[PDB]
Paper text:
[name], the most abundant karyopherin in budding yeast, functions as a primary transporter for the H3:H4/Asf1 complex, whereas Kap121 acts as a secondary transporter. We identify that there are two spatially separated lysine-binding pockets within [name] that specifically interact with H3- and H4-NLSs.
Crystals contain two copies of full-length Kl [name] per asymmetric unit. The first HEAT repeat (residues 1–39), an intra-loop of repeat 8 (residues 325–329), repeat 15 (residues 631–656) and repeat 18 (residues 818–828) are disordered in the final structure. The unique extra-long helix of repeat 23 is conserved in budding yeasts, such as Saccharomyces cerevisiae and [name], and establishes an intra-molecular interaction with repeats 12–14 using electrostatic and hydrogen bond interactions. This interaction may further stabilize the superhelical architecture of Kl [name].
Author numbering: 40 to 70, 76 to 113, 120 to 324, 331 to 630, 657 to 817, 829 to 1113
The structure:
């Protein structure tokens, strides 16, 4: 059997035969013989004498595999590693290394001998290879030392002492041009990141700094530079606390920006339609720093350098800064949005550059801004659209043409419904002309997406184009079933046409879609059975929209579709099959939409769907969050099918159940899965996602989501987790200025309490007791954003409790301190909302606070008034300014309604009227309308002289209300994000009271109201 492969190893004239004999011979070792001494001593002899190194190593590896199953071996190798003869040392170390590579358990008995050996051989003056092998061995030694129950303090100290030597080996390998061993040493430093700190000592920041010096050194070979960039990226994922402690964020960012500024192959960039350059890895480093660190450490340095780089004579620096921003936004979208006053002009400057690489860089930046800040970018369509079209018309490179189309796509998709209509017809004609001219399927795919995005924005305004578009696009979805002979891009073009035709079905509704429903639906049911994961994905996306369009009429298709979806969700995902991951995401969304659009006919599928999804939560690689989200979607469907109307639940702790036993059982199922995926959960994205789902369901259906029958086990578990997140002590945080991801975790943790306060009302006070001091403390954070979240959350909690809140005076006095002393205008703005509410709910004497609070509210008004003077150029400030006007006026109206005779009206009413109508936060109209009803009913002198301004304000309000009603009827199905916020009236009752008021006012002032066209329409 095997011992012949050893004979071949020693003896062939062909060295490549001895080598591959050994490569196979190792494989054989596991699967007896009296004389096994012959094969050891033969191998040891060959390992140290063969002429070529590859044949030496081959014998060495066989010795080791033998080594697992000889008390003299390790002692003899430790002796050989200290031989006077450098080649004998090297081959012994290699064999020791191969032994460590077998993970034999008894190697743990030699930690000290290995530490003492390697402290020596790491600096072997005669063989760089021996130093590199010593570094490589140390990885196994550190792992061995961390298997002790308590890490030996002496091992850690010795091992830490070796770290500077490894750095020397690295410099040695770079100096000597030995890039094979440079790579291996970088693997060693990467392994240091994972180590317990007592093994690595204080070093890690210094390893980062040393890696940065290599990365920016253009004299170093590029592949070594990528290793270095990659190491720092890896340190962001595993050791960000050390990066923060050294405050290296800005140095990392600036180093990466310099590498990305190096020139690149321009013609490749402009034509290649497809990660290992220094320039590309540098962008990935920026991208990861933006996700990992607070924006002061990454985005702020970038925006500081935007002026000088964007004007540089070096086009690669103009290109570099735009691409830097393009990769900043995903990790720091809020900070990026706040810098739009600088960033948008910069993208416009970039589009006007003479160099195409800079123009492409600007386009990539815009695509990235649209993806993350959707409608916020589309507001600038008036500058962008002319520029982007001109680039499409005059493009000389395919990659510019693609990204121009894709930028146009992202803008058009989120254009305001009113504005798209001015563009819709000229746009429609241009995109179909483009579609004809271009024959590349990569380019056609991007044009089809832009067309569908027109439909999405236009809603019912798309009807004139619906039949021509489908006629045309039906050409790209022939022979769906036949995938043999199609390129990946041909598949994408087919898939995108299915997706965007179904999006047109969302724009025009079921009646206008009636012509094509059957052929298109049949075509999509072909897609689902096909062997393209991309094509199946587009089938499910098509079905998801059909569910929105046809509601319960789509139920006859359930028997057919669900079996396909279950099959899609159960597929093996492995070398992670990205196409299957996308398909599963969309199939889960299809299942959710079908469940919410079938109602009673999705009752046979509820239990099987929960079992399939629960299996994915437990076992899937990237579908956990979505699988769990879909489970709550199934619950939402079951609760709606039981005619629990959204927001109509009984408040307070439920002593039993307001839901029938079948529904409660479905709820409890998902409630258990939710809490098991937050308890001890290490991924913050998973925690964020669970908290978001729980808040949403609590908001819609009440406390029955978290508790029933007086048993608060899960409620207390939830609050425990949330409280821990607020304190920074949850498993997902314990692997300052916070990253935005970290800020989201805070926001959604606070929002659990917000939702519970509205669920519980008075009942919440006992739950709130533990979190209340922490939230009051977060209101004082050195971080402005944390203060903004906390003050905002306390105010919503106050709204949740209302007049059943036992802490009004404590909370009132805390928000008054924020209102009075906080340096941030936006924090003071958020506080003024909470202050008015607490006064509205208070039942004790507040006469002592009215005068100081009014003074502070007026100062806040004055700082916002000054900012309002220079903001034709900065919408982030304009939103804060406008929200301050709404909140302060709302709070003042609340104060007057609560205690009119403590507020001197003579100056307050005019200050109120000067900030009406509002531009945002229309919910604050509610106290103001009630105030106007009271002042006019008492014929108050102050408002009576102000009747023109008051009827003028309602003229704006009612015009806005009519636009809102029209926008709602025209819009594309399923765009109900902003529904509550666009409303001018919080209730039909307050709306009708206002109409009667305008009726009276028309009886006085000799028909002042009728004179106005808008109100004449409402008054009659």
């Amino acid at each position: 059997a095997l011992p012949a492969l050893i004979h071949i190893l020693q003896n062939s004239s062909n060295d490549g035969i001895k080598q591959l004999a050994g490569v196979e011979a190792r494989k054989q070792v596991s699967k007896d013989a009296a004389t096994q001494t012959s094969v050891k001593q033969s191998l040891l002899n060959s390992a140290f004498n063969e002429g070529k190194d590859a044949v030496r190593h081959a014998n060495a590896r066989v010795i080791a595999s033998i080594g697992s199953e000889w008390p003299e071996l390790i002692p003899n190798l430790l002796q050989a590693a200290c031989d006077s003869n450098p080649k004998i040392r090297e081959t012994a170390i290699f064999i020791i290394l191969s032994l460590l590579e077998s993970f034999n358990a008894n190697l743990a008995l030699h930690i000290d001998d290995f530490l003492n050996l390697f402290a020596q051989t790491i600096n072997d003056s005669a063989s760089l290879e021996t130093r590199s092998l010593s570094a490589q061995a140390l990885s196994y030694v550190s792992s061995l030392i961390e298997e002790e129950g308590e890490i030996n303090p002496q091992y850690a100290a010795k091992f830490a002492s070796l770290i500077p030597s490894v750095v020397q080996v690295l410099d040695a390998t770079i100096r000597e041009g030995d890039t094979t061993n440079t790579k291996l040493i970088f693997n060693c430093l990467n392994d240091f990141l994972l180590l317990d700190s007592q093994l690595t000592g204080n070093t890690i920041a210094d390893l980062v700094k040393l890696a940065l010096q290599i990365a920016v050194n253009s004299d170093v070979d590029e592949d070594i530079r990528v290793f270095a960039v990659q190491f720092v990226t890896s340190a962001l994922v595993y050791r960000k606390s050390k990066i923060n402690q050294a405050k290296l964020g800005p140095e990392i960012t600036l180093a990466a920006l310099k590498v990305a500024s190096e020139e690149i192959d321009v013609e490749d960039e402009l034509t290649n339609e497809d990660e290992n350059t220094p320039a590309l890895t540098a962008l990935r480093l920026i991208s990861n720093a933006s996700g990992e660190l607070s924006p002061s450490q990454v985005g702020v340095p970038i925006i500081e350098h935007l002026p000088t780089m964007l004007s540089s004579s070096n086009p690669f620096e103009r290109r570099s800064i735009l691409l830097a921003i393009s990769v900043l936004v995903t990790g720091s979208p809020d900070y990026t949005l706040s810098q739009f006053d600088k960033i948008i002009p910069a993208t416009v400057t970039g589009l006007k550059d003479s160099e195409a690489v800079v123009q492409l860089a600007a386009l990539k930046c815009i695509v990235q801004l649209s993806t993350n800040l959707q409608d916020e970018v589309a507001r600038y369509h008036e500058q962008y659209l002319p520029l982007v079209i001109d680039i499409i018309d005059s493009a000389k490179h395919v990659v510019i043409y693609k990204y121009a189309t894709l930028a146009l796509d992202g803008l058009l998709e989120f254009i305001a419904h009113n504005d798209i209509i001015k563009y819709l017809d000229p746009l429609m004609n241009k995109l179909f002309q483009m579609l004809e001219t271009q024959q590349s399927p990569k380019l056609r795919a991007a044009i089809v997406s832009a067309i569908g995005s027109c439909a999405f924005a236009a809603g019912s305004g798309f009807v004139p184009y619906f039949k021509t578009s489908v006629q045309y696009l039906q050409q790209f979805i022939q022979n769906v079933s036949q995938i043999e002979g199609l390129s990946e891009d041909d598949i994408e073009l087919k898939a995108l046409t299915f997706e965007n035709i179904s999006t047109m079905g969302r724009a025009v509704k079921s009646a206008a879609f009636a012509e094509y429903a059957e052929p298109l639906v049949n075509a999509a049911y072909e897609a689902i059975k096909t062997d393209s994961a991309r094509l199946r994905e587009s089938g499910y996306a098509f079905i998801a929209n059909m569910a929105k369009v046809y509601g319960k009429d789509f139920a006859p298709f359930l028997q057919t579709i669900i079996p396909e979806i279950f099959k899609t969700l159960e597929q093996e995902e492995y070398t992670v099959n990205t196409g299957i991951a996308y398909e599963k995401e969309v199939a889960a969304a299809a299942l959710s939409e079908l469940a919410i659009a079938s109602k009673e006919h999705f009752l046979e599928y509820v239990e099987p769907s929960l079992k399939v999804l629960a299996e994915q939560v437990n076992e899937s690689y990237g579908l956990k969050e979505t699988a769990l989200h879909s489970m709550w979607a199934i619950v939402k469907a079951v609760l709606l099918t039981a005619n629990l109307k959204e927001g109509e639940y009984p408040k307070g702790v439920p002593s039993g159940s307001y839901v029938d036993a079948s529904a409660l059982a479905v709820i409890q199922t998902v409630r258990e899965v939710s809490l098991n995926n937050v308890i001890e959960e290490v991924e913050t994205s998973m925690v964020i996602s669970v908290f978001q789902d729980l808040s949403e369901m609590l908001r819609l259906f009440g406390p029955i989501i978290i508790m029933d029958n007086g048993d608060s086990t899960h409620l207390d578990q939830l609050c425990r987790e949330a409280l821990s997140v607020l304190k920074g002590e949850h498993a997902c945080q314990t692997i300052l200025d916070a990253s935005e991801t970290e800020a989201t975790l805070l926001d959604v943790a606070l929002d659990i309490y917000v939702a519970l306060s509205t669920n519980l009302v008075g009942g919440f006070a006992q739950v709130f007791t533990t979190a209340k001091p922490v939230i009051l403390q977060l209101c004082q954070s050195k971080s402005k954003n944390k203060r903004s979240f906390a003050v905002g959350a306390l105010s919503e909690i106050a709204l949740g409790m209302r007049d059943e809140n036992p802490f009004i005076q404590e909370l009132l006095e805390a928000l008054i301190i924020s209102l009075t002393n906080d340096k941030s205008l936006e924090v003071r703005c958020n506080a003024s909302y909470g202050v008015g509410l607490l006064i509205e709910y208070s039942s004790f004497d507040v006469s002592a606070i009215y005068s100081p609070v009014l003074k502070s509210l007026y100062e806040i008004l004055s700082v916002a008034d000054e900012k309002n003077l220079a903001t034709e150029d900065d919408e982030a400030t304009k939103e804060i300014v406008d929200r301050t006007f709404s909140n302060v006026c709302g709070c003042v109206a609340r104060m007057i309604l609560k205690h009119q005779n403590l507020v001197p009206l003579e100056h307050t009413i005019p200050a109120l009227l000067s900030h009406l109508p509002f531009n945002t936060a229309f919910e604050e109209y509610d106290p103001i309308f009630k105030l106007f009803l009271k002042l006019f009913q008492e014929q108050n002198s102050t408002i009576i002289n102000e009747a023109p301004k008051v009827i003028a304000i309602f003229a704006t309000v009612f015009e806005k209300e009519s636009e809102r009603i029209e926008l709602e009827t025209n819009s594309t199905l399923g765009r109900e994000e902003n529904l509550e916020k666009r409303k001018q009236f919080q209730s039909e009752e307050i709306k009708q009271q206002v109409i009667e008021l305008l009726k009276h006012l028309n009886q006085q002032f000799n028909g002042a109201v009728a004179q106005n066209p808008v109100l004449a329409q409402v008054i009659a």
